[PDB]
Amino acid sequence: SMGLPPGWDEYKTHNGKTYYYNHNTKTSTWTDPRMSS
16 A cells, blocks of 8 residues: 555566666666665
């Protein structure tokens, strides 16, 4: 219920890292956006 921001989504890359990406500022990382990245 309303997890990551309206621009932060979770997806697993090749190896399978659930990387979160921001389509509002183009931010690609594996760290949770809810915490700090």
